[PDB]
From Swiss-Prot, chains A, B, C, D, E, F, G:
GO terms for molecular function: ferric iron binding; ferroxidase activity; heme binding; identical protein binding; iron ion binding; iron ion sequestering activity; oxidoreductase activity; protein homodimerization activity. Its EC number is 1.16.3.1. Changing R125A: In strain: ECOR 30. Fe cation 1 binds at E18, E51, H54, E127. Belongs to the bacterioferritin family. The gene is bfr. It comes from Escherichia coli (strain K12). This is Bacterioferritin.
Amino acid sequence: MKGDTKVINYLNKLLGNELVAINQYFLHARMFKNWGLKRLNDVEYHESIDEMKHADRYIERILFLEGLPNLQDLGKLNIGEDVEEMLRSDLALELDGAKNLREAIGYADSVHDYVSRDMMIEILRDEEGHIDWLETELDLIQKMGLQNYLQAQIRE
Amino acid sequence: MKGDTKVINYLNKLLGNELVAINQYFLHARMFKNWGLKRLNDVEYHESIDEMKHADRYIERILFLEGLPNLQDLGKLNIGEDVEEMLRSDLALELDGAKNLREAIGYADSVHDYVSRDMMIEILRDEEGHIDWLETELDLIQKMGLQNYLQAQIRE
Amino acid sequence: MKGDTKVINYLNKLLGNELVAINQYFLHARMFKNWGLKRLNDVEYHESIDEMKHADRYIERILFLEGLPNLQDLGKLNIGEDVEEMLRSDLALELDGAKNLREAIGYADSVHDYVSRDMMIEILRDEEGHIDWLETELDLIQKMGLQNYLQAQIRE
Amino acid sequence: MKGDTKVINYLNKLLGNELVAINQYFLHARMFKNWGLKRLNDVEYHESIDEMKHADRYIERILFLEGLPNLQDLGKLNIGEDVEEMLRSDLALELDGAKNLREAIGYADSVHDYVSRDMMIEILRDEEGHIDWLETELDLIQKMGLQNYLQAQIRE
Amino acid sequence: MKGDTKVINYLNKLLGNELVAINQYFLHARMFKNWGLKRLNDVEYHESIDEMKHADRYIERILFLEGLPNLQDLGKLNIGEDVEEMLRSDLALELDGAKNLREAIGYADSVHDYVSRDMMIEILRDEEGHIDWLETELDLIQKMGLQNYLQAQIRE
Amino acid sequence: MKGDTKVINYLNKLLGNELVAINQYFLHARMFKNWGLKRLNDVEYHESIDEMKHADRYIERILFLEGLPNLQDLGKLNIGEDVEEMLRSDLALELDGAKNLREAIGYADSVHDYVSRDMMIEILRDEEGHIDWLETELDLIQKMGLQNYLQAQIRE
Amino acid sequence: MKGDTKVINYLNKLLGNELVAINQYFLHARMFKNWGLKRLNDVEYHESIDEMKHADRYIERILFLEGLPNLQDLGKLNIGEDVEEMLRSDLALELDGAKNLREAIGYADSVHDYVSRDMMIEILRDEEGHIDWLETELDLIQKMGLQNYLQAQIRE
Ligand code: HEM
Ligand code: HEM
Ligand code: HEM
Ligand code: HEM
Ligand SMILES: [Fe+2]
Ligand SMILES: [Fe+2]
Ligand SMILES: [Fe+2]
Ligand SMILES: [Fe+2]
Ligand SMILES: [Fe+2]
Ligand SMILES: [Fe+2]
Ligand SMILES: [Fe+2]
Ligand SMILES: [Fe+2]
Ligand SMILES: [Fe+2]
Ligand SMILES: [Fe+2]
Ligand SMILES: [Fe+2]
Ligand SMILES: [Fe+2]
Ligand SMILES: [Fe+2]
Ligand SMILES: [Fe+2]
């Protein structure tokens, strides 16, 4: 079915967000795993899979709407060198993605692409969960301190 | 069966206590859950259910004794902004409820409402358990310190 | 995540509706149970649980959006003294809640709070079911008469 | 296999009957369901499926006999506004269908289309069952009265 | 163990109440069964067993306290000739038994026979349940009318 | 609950679309089955059931909103005489239905009928799947040729 | 453990190959899926997972050897517009990756990084399998022709 061109660009832009998230989260995961922070590796790894599921949905949608998924361009990864910096970087990434999502959803509605919209709201709901998790973790670090926080990540 | 009027007022007053406890405990629970303090969310949530069971018992009793359960008036909730303050507030609530319970039990006995009395003693026994749990938690916070205490609530 | 302030007020107002519904439905339930109308006690009781689930969703959402859930203020309960009056009172309550819900949903959409919106539409769908059930019961009372209707509620 | 042309017209006419029955029964079903008359919704719904099975048999037969099933023309639905009127309308529909069936069966026999005939007799046997059920229900309404009859439909 | 003499007299008086209840309930049960009121036979029969359990408890207690259980004297049975009269008669019986129970419980407490007391409160709690059931049934008779009430007792 | 009149007309119009789809798909199915194209009979048959599920949803919704479902008027079926023509006709039908759906969804939103809207978006999502399937099949016919395509439909 | 710097660069380069393969294969997969070529979607999808497993191994290894995995730079994807072109593009990609792999393996051996070597030989063995599969598919296309080849991909 020929889709609205601007919806397709939005979908590709969103796809673009997912593919930075996929990599940044995956590297973070294995950084944590390396450091022995087993618990944070399990969670970030599973968020990486989450972003992959999202990318797949965009890809199938773009293809269905007869556009070209763009997996060629990769935005800026911001990796960071310690637990806090890296969680904080994932949070900024999620917050930017949510911003773009809110914009795309409004636009899909106004051209009547209600199923692209519905798919995007489901994704947003997931993003909002990722945001909840990062925010809580970052606060726990302050509340219990870094040393206690790290000890808490040792067993899955 | 027509009950003693003053027993009914006592039952309604006690019902009133349960309904503040229900709300205060439920909010506290989801405050803890939000903060990632998973363990305290499980316990307060289950105390919330406990207070609901109590309310139900009062309601069925009042109705049986042919009075009007009053779910309209809600006493003061005292929420508090951090773990200690909030546990401490639940403890004062429990202590006030126990006080009212002791009074009602004595009065039920003197008008021969032994089954209202028996029901109230069972509830009091539960309250006294809630009091035990709050007192222990509050002491643990001092003994192990706030940071260690918080780390201890992360996993259920 | 910091939410839109007006969405939070709406959420608290809706939460407020749920908490009157919870109490009014619960009392009605146990009034029916007392009268031996076993079937109406099962249904209203299960609607009470429904409204509790709703309240919980609002509470977690408000907390997530970083506002203060307000469980302190309780609107007017309208209890009523016989089956019809009481069903009819639940129906007016549901109709008012749906009205507020329609308003909040439109507003969430216009500030792009699509996940609050999505949650609210799911709740509205439940409310609309509660409305269907009340409307049908009230009509059955007229169609079959009050005596036959009551006999019909004796066994669950 | 090339069939007798007039058998095909009969088959299409009968198919036509089934397709009004399908719709009228389905709407009636969901009218009863809406009104809370759960028992009548189950039965009419299952008669709707029955008529669908019949239509399917006609369609496959027409196709086998190399004619064109006509699903384009739809006869008059007569819906009615209350339980009796609506049951009574289904009964007139069944009685008309049986009449057409008796005629087609006789004609199939005389051109030696014995398998069309055999299929039609099986269907007629079903119709005659639907007629039995409507007649009994209509009589029960008089014998027990409308109010008792309605109370009797509340549980499946 | 030698018990307080007056506690023993109370126990025998209460035993006396149970033995009228046993008979009156059993006859009522089989009267209902004869009349085809299957549901009321099941309930009254099970209340008969209940009163037997009570009598047994008194008998074992009296014997333990070294008194003589008196099964010789039987109070007045009041049977009645129709469903209402008979339910109403069971209710007056229960109300009289509860009165005697309240008196005995107070007295046991004041001579420190706390286990006799505890046993009596458990029994009272059962009586109060029997009272609830009779009161509800009697009200259902008025609310739904005698004919509908009787039809409602036909199947267990 | 009294619904918006124009939503009801839309619902009836959409219901109208479903009922042509139901018939056209069912006939197509049994045409394919007759021709031995077993695979296409399974799929179109299951799309027929899909459209039935849709019709049912409209019917229950209209009834709930207190309007009259219209199963009397049947739009134009366009049957076609060979596989391609017939698939292509189903595709035009789906495309027209999606158009009407997009319009109704926008309108439901603006009168705040969010649950009708939610139901319509779910249906649209299904339609969009039916469109995907038809488009793919039509392209496969060109890519692999008609003869290979037909051989491919012989086994389910 | 501090690794040899040049082994780390090789590992990152190889990682780089895997990440183009991951995307190109994933898009190809969903392109085939869209076109209904179900069989080719299953295989390319599973090759995508394969390349992901490879990337993960590089990432964990680089991290272990204390270097920085580079997921930021993405080489050229070459997508192509039809089945042959796209398979042929995957084959060129695999052939280039194998070339780099052969070079890295020889170099790891000469600095005594035998476990990086062992890991690389296992990966190479997988690549060589991917190459086998592409080569066979491309030949099947010529041997059986494009139309027969496409029909052959319709069912998984
Ligand atoms: C105020 C008077 C209330 C009464 C009398 C009441 C009564 C009850 C009862 C009897 C239960 C079942 C307990 C059991 O058998 O395990 C229950 C469950 C529950 N209640 Fe309430 N309730 C009240 C208010 C609330 C409130 C304000 C909330 C907060 C949202 C709430 C949340 C819940 C939840 C989440 C469940 C369990 C549902 C599940 O299975 O997931 N209740 N309630
Ligand atoms: C036009 C209004 C119709 C409505 C609202 C309707 C509704 C339904 C529904 C709800 C089902 C059950 C779906 C499920 O749970 O699997 C069903 C089944 C079915 N329908 Fe229809 N239907 C309609 C017309 C037709 C027509 C014209 C035919 C053609 C003969 C047909 C053929 C069938 C068949 C063969 C089944 C499966 C029954 C079985 O299990 O054997 N329907 N229908
Ligand atoms: C005088 C008229 C009475 C009648 C017609 C009667 C009838 C019955 C019947 C039919 C059973 C059930 C038998 C079975 O199926 O196993 C039963 C059980 C029993 N009866 Fe009686 N009974 C009478 C008096 C009493 C008395 C005075 C006592 C002394 C306390 C007594 C004690 C019991 C006990 C302990 C059971 C067993 C219940 C259980 O399963 O726990 N009954 N009775
Ligand atoms: C960038 C585009 C990518 C897409 C669209 C994608 C897609 C997927 C999907 C759909 C799954 C299976 C999830 C399910 O069960 O449904 C998966 C699994 C997986 N992915 Fe990705 N992926 C991508 C990139 C990556 C990257 C860069 C890595 C890093 C090495 C990676 C690592 C993994 C791993 C380790 C698994 C699971 C393997 C297992 O342990 O069973 N993926 N991917
Ligand atoms: Fe995402
Ligand atoms: Fe995310
Ligand atoms: Fe309590
Ligand atoms: Fe308590
Ligand atoms: Fe609600
Ligand atoms: Fe509600
Ligand atoms: Fe039929
Ligand atoms: Fe029929
Ligand atoms: Fe007793
Ligand atoms: Fe008793
Ligand atoms: Fe449809
Ligand atoms: Fe469709
Ligand atoms: Fe690879
Ligand atoms: Fe490879």
